[model samples]
Target: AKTHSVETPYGSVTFTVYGTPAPARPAILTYHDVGLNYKSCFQPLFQFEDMQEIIQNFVRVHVDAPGMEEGAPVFPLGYQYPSLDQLADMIPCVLQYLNFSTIIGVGVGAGAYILARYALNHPDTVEGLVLINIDPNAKGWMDWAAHKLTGLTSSIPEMILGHLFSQEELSGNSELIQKYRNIITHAPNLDNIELYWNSYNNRRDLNFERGGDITLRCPVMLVVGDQAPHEDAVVECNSKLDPTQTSFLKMADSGGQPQLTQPGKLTEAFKYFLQGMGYMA
Candidate 1:
């Protein structure tokens, strides 16, 4: 897989394209959560042995969001990071650039929000969705105030870890949490990371509900881990979507990042999801 950079209206984004894209097969398009680039976020799940068969069969597009690429330089001063809507809008350029027609989108947290927007905007080009730990609304007044206070007193990495993990996991010195904490701490540009984090915090409500105006055209599978920080939020999102077109999968013995904690289970669910969409024979 080679890395390719594309300039979108919102900003410049980098992507790593893997495998030879087969005609008539939808590509696997993925976006990582806040505080992570594609490699750090997805490598383990996609690189899992059981995932190889699926990976080899379709083109894989791993999007590193604006300023989220590995070893990226600090964003120029005063650069305004795109809001989640703008980030969603920028995806088409990557698809168009590769001349791919449709995709099965896999996104986590902030990434999930962006993919949901893309699916709503261009339903014709999206085949299915796997949204992990997705929260569909903007922060409420209380939530916003708590986050603002934390931003003032805590390090950005600590704040991000809280957003990314379960309180139980964070309660102890979990190795996985510590590793990501170190990675976030040593990232090339904390300013860029903070900008993306703030943009996510400021995201607008995505009007997708059971009886709401914006209905997702493609089949959606909402995933969360047991006792994960976002389990309730994901459950709430499930209640809002069309049950017929949606599936909720709560993995046991897992937390915040199911794709990381239960990659095999998630990979299996993705296969079933693809089969339901008439893929993978």
Candidate 2:
């Protein structure tokens, strides 16, 4: 859990470099979902028995950006946020601060949005890409939907949450439901969420119309749970891009977050994808 704070024009950002001390390869700097720290999104990578070997195989890093304050409690209310491109502009400095070489990008949900933005800006700096539970087209749909749903304040959160998990999952898993409730109940309190909402809804500068260009250089490996609404978008993105340079992994029964719902499956898919790209031996 080695952590550091980097100063950016927007704010002070916190990030953690995880895994063992070893020569850094193309380090995978993960951006977490909205309102969650790297740990909240990344812990699943460590918890799975299958990923232990993968973690030992390469240098992996996790980071949170400047839009939010570190260690703040979760927000009880729902909030909207900026698109990933705005945050992508700041990551190069963070990479320089860590003195990392090239990067192997991986992210989930909102973090995946950030990854897409980074790939668009720094094509040469990225070796490969992995996005979980997010559609590169999110900004387009979300922007329109935000305007449509403004009258029903609660509808926005409910719609977003509804897309994350399948009805079957919510009905069958009591513990999972409780966990979801816990996070949702507190999500609004996190500084990132506030920043995200403000940046998107109020500030309006955080939009990324060019996010589709992110896949231009690197080979992409997309993972989405079979039940996630974003699954089709993940496949659609993969298909629109050069298929020879892109791969897909779909996990059954898992929703938007295979990292939490099916870490073992995600680990296997990720390791194989990275190895296939020749990043890992």
Candidate 3:
């Protein structure tokens, strides 16, 4: 794995690259959820100790948001959509550096929303997409209700963790809960937490001028836990989209973030989808 700083028109962006020995071709552009950075999110996708097998088939790049790096100043200063746009802008610059012929954009949670938006804007650049537990068109009021219901942004991971597991599993198995809790508690410093919170709040408060522009030309695979809030929206959006170009997969036992809950399963699903589309293997 190698890290490089790519200067974008918005700001200097730092991204990590896992190289593929094969000829330059399509690459996977991974985006993390609101709180976690790219590294944390991609850790699960590359399940093998050495990602040489997957990397050798296709380049995998993880993008970082502007002004949100470790120790960097808090971005946007407050909840704002412009900040989200700035993070989205970093994509083109990073893609320019990778110079892949085709791109697969994968995002989990809020990261999925960002990628979905980007794919809609530049469908030509995206060959395929994989969204994990994302619902950009989720009713704003519903999100607000969730925020009010929880009373704590920090409670989200916990709530999601609890929902991901069945009651029997949580009560009967001590080790499973511990594993999930570990991932949820893996928080960075204050700045990182602020970045995540602000990003999420911005989207939660996001007001769209219009709807139904949520269309994409490339094939899409939406993966979400059956119990997640966004699962319905994902199904709804896909149903409204061009059917020939969309697919949805719901993990019977998984919740909001399958990357954290079912990493190995996700890896196999991703590999099959990518290879099936001729993007990998």
Question: Each model's TM-score, in the order given?
Answer: 0.96, 0.82, 0.78
**Backbone collision count in every prediction?**
0, 10, 0
Model 3: residues with Cα > 4 Å off, grouped in runs: 21-24, 49-52, 67-82, 152-188, 204-214
lDDT, residue 121, candidate 1: 89
Reference-based lDDT, each prediction: 0.89, 0.67, 0.65
> Judged by lDDT against the true structure, how good is candidate 2?
0.67
Residue-level lDDT of model 2, residues 1-281, one tens digit each, is: 67777766544567777776566568877877654556556776765777777777666777775544355444344433334565777788788887876888888766776777777678888888888865665346666676557536654344434545666666666686668656755664544554554443332221332235434577778888886767777777666666777788888877766787778777878878877887664
Cα lDDT tens digits for candidate 1, 1-281: 79998888887889999998588888999999999888888999999998988778899999998888877889888988899999999899999999999998999999999999889889999989999999898889999888888789888888888888887888776788888888888887788989999888999888776787788888899999888878888999888898988999999877888888889988898888888888873
Provide the lDDT at 230 for model 3.
Answer: 66
* Model 1, position 181: C-alpha lDDT score: 81
lDDT of 3: 0.65
Clashing residue pairs in candidate 2 (N, C-alpha, C atoms within 3 angstroms):
74-186, 74-189, 75-186, 75-187, 75-188, 75-189, 80-197, 81-196, 81-197, 82-196
Cα displacement (Å) at residue 21, model 1: 2.4
Tens-digit lDDT track for model 3 on 175-262? Answer: 6466655655564344455555555556532222223454677777888877566677666656665666677888876655667667
